[PDB]
Amino acid sequence: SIAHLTSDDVNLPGSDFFRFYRSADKQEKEKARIYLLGVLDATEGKSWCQYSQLQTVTLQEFVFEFFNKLPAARLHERAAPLIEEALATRFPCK
Amino acid sequence: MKPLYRQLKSSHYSSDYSSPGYLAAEAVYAEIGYELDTLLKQNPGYANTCAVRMSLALLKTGISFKGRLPIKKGAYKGKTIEPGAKLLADQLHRSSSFGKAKIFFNAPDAEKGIGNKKGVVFFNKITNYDGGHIDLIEPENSLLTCHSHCYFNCKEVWFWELS
């Protein structure tokens, strides 16, 4: 596993992301939420829609719930596509 | 009459996954007799639950308000939920036992005005989102923290102080 989240942690596994995402350290949790922000901005209006209709806390809640219900086997997948899947499947562009 | 802050907080389900008061949207809607997935198909906006959560907290503290969403199950069957933050805020402001909110037109004013106090906050017209956010706010260290989320990136901050 990765100890703490840095900008060098490319190909970030779902398990590592999810650990930082839930961190009791507010700065660590914020860093994980910023990784999420990058993924959101990269995919919004393309695979899922959309900022005008969905608050950041809403996006954050649904991402958490997806990760929380994920079979342990899937946590080895990269964090970004998992996040994308979470939102694409619930909030498609129409 | 106006509820204490702690009582209202105790009846409020946070939508912040990291909060000790957290409850997920599916469980929140289930309590009042709705299926989250059904609602999302009607309108994705139902995913934004701050006003649903605030409505429920108000009901649980004996506070009266008009809502558009009829409650189908549980202790408050026959009562209503207001799922829109602005609509709920407009009602608390125009016509409730909370009285009129203090209105701030920028974040610095809001932060100084709220100061060390606690109560109900409404963030009106959030940047990049078509709507607002209603929540509970209180000091933590020397910063303000909301039960679910703060949105000072907005046009106006309304505040009703609670004891």
Numbering used by the authors:
A (entry chain A): 30 to 123
B (entry chain B): 1 to 163
Authors' description from the paper:
Some Gram-negative bacteria target their competitors by exploiting the type VI secretion system to extrude toxic effector proteins. To prevent self-harm, these bacteria also produce highly specific immunity proteins that neutralize these antagonistic effectors. The opportunistic pathogen Serratia marcescens has recently been shown to utilize T6-dependent secretion of two family 4 amidases, Ssp1 and Ssp2, to mediate antibacterial activity. In S. marcescens, the resistance-associated proteins Rap1a and Rap2a neutralize Ssp1 and Ssp2, respectively.
Following purification using a co-expression strategy, we determined the structure of the Ssp1–Rap1a complex at about 2.0 Å resolution. The structure of the Ssp1–Rap1a complex revealed a tightly bound heteromeric assembly with two effector molecules flanking a Rap1a dimer. The overall dimensions of this heteromeric assembly are about 90 × 50 × 50 Å and its molecular weight is approximately 60 kDa, consistent with that observed by size-exclusion chromatography during purification of the complex. The model contains residues 1–163 of Ssp1 and residues 30–123 of Rap1a. The solvent-accessible surface area of Ssp1 is 5840 Å2 and about 16% of this (960 Å2) is occluded when the complex with Rap1a is formed. Rap1a interacts with Ssp1 using residues in α1, α3, α4, α5 and the α4–α5 loop. In particular, the α4–α5 loop and α4 of Rap1a are directly positioned to block the Ssp1 active site. Arg119, Arg66, Lys59, Glu94 and Glu94 of Rap1a form salt-bridge interactions with Asp37, Asp16, Glu140, Arg53 and Arg53 of Ssp1, respectively. In the α1–α2 loop of Ssp1, Tyr17 is relocated by about 7 Å to interact with Tyr50 and Arg62 of Rap1a. Rap1a, which has a completely different fold to the conventional Tai4 proteins, does not possess a protruding loop, but in the complex a helix is positioned to block the effector active site and the interactions that stabilize the complex involve residues in the C-terminal subdomain of the effector rather than the N-terminal subdomain.
